[PDB]
Paper text:
Macrophage-expressed gene 1 ([name], also termed [name]) is one of the most ancient and highly conserved members of the membrane attack complex (MAC)/perforin-like (PF)/cholesterol-dependent cytolysin (MACPF/CDC) superfamily, with orthologous sequences identifiable throughout the metazoan. In contrast to other perforin-like proteins characterised to date, human [name] is an integral type-1 transmembrane protein. The mature protein is comprised of three regions; an ectodomain located in the vesicular lumen, a transmembrane domain anchor that spans the vesicular membrane and, finally, a short cytosolic sequence. Each monomer of the 16-subunit ring possesses an N-terminal MACPF/CDC domain, a central multi-vesicular body of 12 kDa (MVB12)-associated β-prism (MABP) domain and a C-terminal region (termed the L-domain).
Indeed, our (ultimately unsuccessful) attempts to disrupt the interface between the double ring serendipitously led to our identifying the [name] [name] mutation as yielding a greatly improved sample and an improvement in global resolution to 2.4 Å (workflow described in detail in the methods). This mutation resulted in two different MPEG1L425K assemblies, one of which involved domain swapping between the two head-to-head coordinated rings. In contrast to other MACPF/CDCs studied to date, the recombinant form of [name] has pre-assembled into a soluble oligomer that exhibits the expected features of a prepore assembly. Within each subunit, both TMH-1 and -2 are folded as small helical bundles. A central feature of the assembly is a 64-stranded β-barrel that represents the top, preformed portion of the future pore. The majority of MACPF/CDC domain-mediated inter-subunit interactions are formed around the central lumen of the β-barrel. Around the outside of the assembly both the MABP domain and the L-domain also mediate extensive inter-subunit interactions. The L-domain forms substantial inter-subunit interactions in trans with an extraordinary elongated β-hairpin that extends from the MABP domain of the adjacent subunit (the MABP β-hairpin).
Residue numbers in the entry:
A (entry chain G), B (entry chain H), C (entry chain F): 11 to 211, 214 to 394, 403 to 421, 430 to 448, 460 to 498, 503 to 524, 536 to 629
Amino acid sequence: EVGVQKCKNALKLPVLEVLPGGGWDNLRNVDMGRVMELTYSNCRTTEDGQYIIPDEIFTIPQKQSNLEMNSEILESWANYQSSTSYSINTELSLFSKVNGKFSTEFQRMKTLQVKDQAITTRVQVRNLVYTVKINPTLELSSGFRKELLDISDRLENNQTRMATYLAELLVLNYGTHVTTSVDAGAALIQEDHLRASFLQDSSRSAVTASAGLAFQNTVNFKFEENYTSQNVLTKSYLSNRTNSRVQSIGGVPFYPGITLQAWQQGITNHLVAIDRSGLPLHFFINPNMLPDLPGPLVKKVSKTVETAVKRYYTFNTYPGCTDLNSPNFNFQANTDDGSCEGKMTNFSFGGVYQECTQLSGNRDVLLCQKLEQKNPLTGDFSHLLSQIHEEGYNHLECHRKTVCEDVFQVAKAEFRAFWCLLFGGLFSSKSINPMTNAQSCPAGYFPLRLFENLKVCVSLGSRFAVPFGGFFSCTVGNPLVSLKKCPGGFSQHPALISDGCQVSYCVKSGLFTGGSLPPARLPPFTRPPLMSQAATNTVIVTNSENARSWIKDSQTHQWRLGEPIELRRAMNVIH
Amino acid sequence: EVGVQKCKNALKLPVLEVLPGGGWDNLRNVDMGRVMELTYSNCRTTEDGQYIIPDEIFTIPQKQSNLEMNSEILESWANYQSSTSYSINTELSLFSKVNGKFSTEFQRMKTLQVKDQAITTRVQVRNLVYTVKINPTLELSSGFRKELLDISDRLENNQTRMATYLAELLVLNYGTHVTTSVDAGAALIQEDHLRASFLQDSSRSAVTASAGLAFQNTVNFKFEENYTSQNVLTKSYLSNRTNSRVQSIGGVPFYPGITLQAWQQGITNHLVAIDRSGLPLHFFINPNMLPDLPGPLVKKVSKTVETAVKRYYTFNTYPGCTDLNSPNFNFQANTDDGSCEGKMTNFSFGGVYQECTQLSGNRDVLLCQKLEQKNPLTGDFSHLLSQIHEEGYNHLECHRKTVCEDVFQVAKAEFRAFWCLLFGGLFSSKSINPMTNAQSCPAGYFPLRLFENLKVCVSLGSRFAVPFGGFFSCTVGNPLVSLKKCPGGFSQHPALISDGCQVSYCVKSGLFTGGSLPPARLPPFTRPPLMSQAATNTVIVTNSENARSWIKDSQTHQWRLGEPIELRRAMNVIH
Amino acid sequence: EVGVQKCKNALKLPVLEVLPGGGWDNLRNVDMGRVMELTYSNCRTTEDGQYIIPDEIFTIPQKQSNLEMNSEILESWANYQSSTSYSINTELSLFSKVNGKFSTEFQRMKTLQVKDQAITTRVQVRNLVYTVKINPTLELSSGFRKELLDISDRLENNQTRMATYLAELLVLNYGTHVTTSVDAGAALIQEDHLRASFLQDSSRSAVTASAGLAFQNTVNFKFEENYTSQNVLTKSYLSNRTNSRVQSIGGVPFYPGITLQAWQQGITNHLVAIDRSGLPLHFFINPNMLPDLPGPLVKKVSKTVETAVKRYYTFNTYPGCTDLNSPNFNFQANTDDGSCEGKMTNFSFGGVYQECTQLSGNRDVLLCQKLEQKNPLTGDFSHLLSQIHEEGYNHLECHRKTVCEDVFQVAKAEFRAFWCLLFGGLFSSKSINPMTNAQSCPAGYFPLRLFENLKVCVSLGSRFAVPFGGFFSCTVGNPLVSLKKCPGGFSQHPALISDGCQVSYCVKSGLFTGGSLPPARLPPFTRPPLMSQAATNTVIVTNSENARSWIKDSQTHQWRLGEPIELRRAMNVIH
Ligand SMILES: *[C@@H]1O[C@H](CO)[C@@H](O[C@@H]2O[C@H](CO)[C@@H](O)[C@H](O)[C@H]2NC(C)=O)[C@H](O)[C@H]1NC(C)=O
Ligand SMILES: *[C@@H]1O[C@H](CO)[C@@H](O[C@@H]2O[C@H](CO)[C@@H](O)[C@H](O)[C@H]2NC(C)=O)[C@H](O)[C@H]1NC(C)=O
Ligand SMILES: *[C@@H]1O[C@H](CO)[C@@H](O[C@@H]2O[C@H](CO)[C@@H](O)[C@H](O)[C@H]2NC(C)=O)[C@H](O)[C@H]1NC(C)=O
Ligand SMILES: *[C@@H]1O[C@H](CO)[C@@H](O)[C@H](O)[C@H]1NC(C)=O
Ligand SMILES: *[C@@H]1O[C@H](CO)[C@@H](O)[C@H](O)[C@H]1NC(C)=O
Ligand SMILES: *[C@@H]1O[C@H](CO)[C@@H](O)[C@H](O)[C@H]1NC(C)=O
């Protein structure tokens, strides 16, 4: 009797199930949580009277049905076209070559093209019924507004490591984009994979017309073979096809033999999104959407969320060779590198060493064990990055009467990795060693620990040997090519992202390259901080350019614009 | 019981779903938000008693059904005819060659004509049921009126950078035009693509009559082949066709085998817009639509919105070669240039350099790093534009008792780009480098940063080398052709629109040209300003020519016409 | 009238049976108990109005139907793809090669590939109807919250052995993961096993197209043979197939002859989970989910549960040879080792001996019997690990009047195992001796007890002799290869996990290898402790870095933030 069911009891007609305002992960092409609030307290319908819609949603009747007679030809996976989220992937961004490269649809097409040198053809029927958009005047959802205020509280109390962590949880829960418009409808798609040698034989206009005719035979005729696309060209066509599937998106489920008439009757009340557009997530963090906060404080929240989205694109970028016919083809690479024609020069190094340094003298945990490692061939330790490894421990003291008390300290320790035998190559915790596919070293190799969770397999051992190309990081390059990329003929691979620092290495294995595609490193990219910083309660927020000031009322009820008498009355206890 | 549902419960008949008064993007041909207010508080219907309409909408019964026997022939994509928004694209404007050039329908026709040298034919059935118009006496919507008052407030407080930003958000949300009349109906269209060599063979009257006959075979007969357009001419016709599709726009969804009788029965209650006319968005910003504002103040708001629409057309204009048979054909060019017959002269330059200058001496951010770059071949830095790069930072001081306070400053910095090796060529953030299609430099090339987010790949490296043609901007041309265009044989490409300043460059690659079509740079074209200006509260608005004056009542309730006693009583505290 | 049935009586429509928020065992791929709370006190439905859902669950309408024409080919069991829990097995973890390796589906595929050198093909129809996710703002279930507070109470009272035991009961009841999203739908799968020699014969595209055609003959046609996939290729295909099954997952039960039309009608109200994603179990133990506990205390609970999950993966990891064509293939090994090419060197040892040491002088139990064993060939006892064997006993004293009293002591005893004849080899309690498959020694062999429940069969006896490779443990390696792995040509086998210490041994039998697959060692891996430690009641919890403190109110009602007056008032009785 309140909200959705009040409309449904009064009107007796369904609710439109394709709605914008939700979050969107633009790498995986999945829907990620509700950013905007959608309330039903006006009983609004679409103007044809078919669907209940939210009060702040307007629809545009398209009623458009497209029917193709020819299949398209998609030449390569690098220029990927989604067919269900095409508008939001190809937006103007500095990340356009990574969008949609971790979706289930893309992983299947990249596998099938590389595995048996195939090109993909697509023919489809497409029904666009409504375009569904948000109004510009629109409020945030309560769950999304609450998680933005928590990032604001951690930035006031100078808890930057905690605020960066909560921003990466926001990207995990709400994605990178917010959909502002969705195309509601249904589609029926056939996707074939043909040998690339069959293409280059005048050719293309006769192939694609037969693929579109075979598609209409598959839908209209039953599984008993009564087709009409059987001629001389099809006997070669059926033998060069390496894979074939039919998918329905919306409507009734497809089976071979449903007519195109009957599939188009079941589209009603089964609409899904077949296209969508949107804006980045930090666009909707501005003083208009968050009115009960100071001005420059929400631009600091929006800058934190924007940095978290940009890390999510950078940690999932794989530069490398992309040209399939060339040697040193990198199958895990989603971005080209220019290293297709690469001359390889072998060069070795002695070993890799570490040292450990404790800022706090600890008699409890003894962090120096299993953190420092010396060279096997030099004997002692003889820079990549510079970071601090903290750990919390517990004291527990009593006094007999028995009551007790426990204090929690933070044991700090600091390590330094360095480079300047037999390989290998390496494996971290979260990765495996593709020399063994086993998170272990081969026979005759002992692991060298170079980080907190990374092992390097180093020693008859020449049967497993792979070359080497250097290390680099997000701040330090390598001189082997102060530049980030590998030398030519080498492929780069991530190894133990630590505190938001991507450190990589270069090899010439060929077995680190092949295998399954990497499944999309998700935030958070840092362990939760140990809360090593005290809450510094800010009371006055101001900026010098506007001479505007914000003072919140005790005890932390609401922010409020200031008055120059109330400023210096509060600046006396502040300064 | 209030508004729409009060009419529907009383009358028991649907609402007309094709309504004017909404916003319209004339580049992409999409509907963009509601500009006019449409209320239903009279229960008005169309005069045939079929549809509920708004109170300020009048309809004209057309009841017109057009049935073509011959296909048209559309000769080229430059003279594009939309078939669903033809009247509003071809209006009298200074932008007529860019209208509709980013719509989904145009992108498909330009691709299919260029890819296999095709000409497009179109045959259609078209039902115009109503012409639906707005009355001249009409009010603005509440959401659109609210966003115009926010532009008025930023212009009163001398916040010009914020008012320009809010005007570009108005174009993003509400488009460039407002539809004043829409043609409600349904259409059934077949679009073929034939080889251009098949056209020039007496010919045209026999081709188009067979295409119109094949269209009526496709609709009337089932997918089982029982057609009557099978003769000697069709066997050549079926072999020169490169693509074919059938689309329905409104009505029931099309399938091959629905009769033309049956398709025309399902048009009722499924009407869509098949044509529309309209006026520019700034036409509706005038003292009659906004009565509760001063006179010259709304002409300042209308001039701001008009400038924002004109930037949206200018940033999406691509001059270049258009003649398909000529060399140096620019596939990304939507506007002709006159550089079809172009003689190429090679000429090099040494390098490109920058200097940085801080207006504020900052001991916190140190903007000089990663902003200045020197020449690799000269050693030191030895003009395109002149703009200021600002950045906000945060101080945080405490006093132990612990309360705190944080001030936000604006760190200003100013850079200068300059021109007067091996290429290349370049890539910005939001663009990629089409030498690699990868947002990266080729092998042997290191990036030269020339802007805040732009890289220029400059060094065996002659295998990737492309020529060079110069730089120019919206204020500074180049002498290589003080003129804006490229020299002959070169194509221009945008690179890092910065603060509303289009700066471009010229190349002779051939790989920067090809690829997918650019997807329509959308507003805002500037980052949000850092609010570096104080609110100057204007109280009296007047003009010298009329001697009329407007004084708003404290505290900022409403504007009001003035009296000469109340002027000098308020001019005493003003001057 | 309260909860679930209140919704069902009002709405008269079923409840969605595929819900996230439950626990998940990622080794066995089974559902393990309810972690999150799901309440129905809003009568929420899916937006198509088909299913009642919980109030903190949102669904995404997918309505997606995939229909494959070609079977896949899965090359080996090491790269296992689950087809029903594929997303949660292949997550980014340091355990990725053990996930799903104890599920019923994997045990069948690994058996059928090894037994008759087979490769597996899979073809499937797959209907994804909804994606069902949890909101980020979500509370824990009452049963799961109660078992986390019990781990908190044992850590306050310094009862670490009891808290480690209750953490392993949490993994047994609630699994290792929590599902955050489930794909609701139905699938119809055919899985064949073909001879691997039939694969390598152009070949793969004709095999998989016939397997997909035979699948559609099996579903559509009745058991009376009327198939259409009968040609020259199938007569070889039917003879190289070693096993074949059809499974339905969701929907109506499959029988040969149900049409694909009829199977897709019965999917409604019979949805199951066909994919799922999730996060580790210790991710949901944080101060936001448990608000009524101190800060650093729940990070100690989360570290205890994380250690228990990591033991569950480590005790079920079997390194060894994996290459099927090589000798010394280890059938029980689920993780590769690099010991495929291994040269075997025979070397013997004299014997194994033990000594016992009692820390408490006991005149009641006499633990020295059946705990110490000497060498048969040396005569006396002449280190693996160092652990204490405790035992509780009972006194019972009376005084005639007759009332009584019984005290429970803890008899401590400590044993030491050592190494430095004829085999063998050994058997523990929970294992058997695969030389006899009988938990007994062969003829001519007497058992040598090396642990509390382990026997070693050591002596005409050369007919049962197997070689030897050494012992090692989780802290002590062996020098025969201070390294953990076996020497080459040897396989490792677990033997009597004792107090969380995996101690293993190496053999070259070939009969310890073969047999059935090991059925997934489940927690707890330790007997319950004898409660040998007094409750040390902590009252004040604090940490030095934040200077925050928590004081619970007498008598142990609730925790509460502290005040500096109440600290030293409570630190007086504490110190
Ligand atoms: C893959 O396609 C090629 C064509 O590019 C096929 O080769 C032709 O097959 C037809 C079939 O009878 C022959 O008549 C031609 O002589 C073949 N050669 C050429 C150059 O056209 C090839 O057969 C296809 N692959 C398979 C496995 O059939
Ligand atoms: C494309 O169109 C041309 C005509 O412009 C076709 O060429 C003719 O095809 C017919 C078909 O039998 C022949 O009888 C003529 O002799 C051809 N030449 C001329 C000059 O008319 C051409 O065949 C078409 N393309 C394809 C692939 O069929
Ligand atoms: C297993 O597969 C092999 C093919 O790899 C079969 O061998 C062929 O069988 C056909 C059947 O008539 C013969 O015509 C061929 O001459 C055989 N050899 C080759 C090299 O193709 C084998 O028969 C299959 N196993 C069984 C038991 O039938
Ligand atoms: C804020 O945190 C930073 C973190 O390093 C620290 O350096 C700084 O001193 C802190 N400032 C205050 C006022 O607490
Ligand atoms: C806590 O338990 C450990 C277990 O060995 C013991 O060593 C320690 O003395 C105990 N501390 C207190 C305060 O009871
Ligand atoms: C308990 O029973 C045992 C049984 O043999 C006996 O030896 C012992 O004396 C009894 N103790 C008491 C206190 O009754």
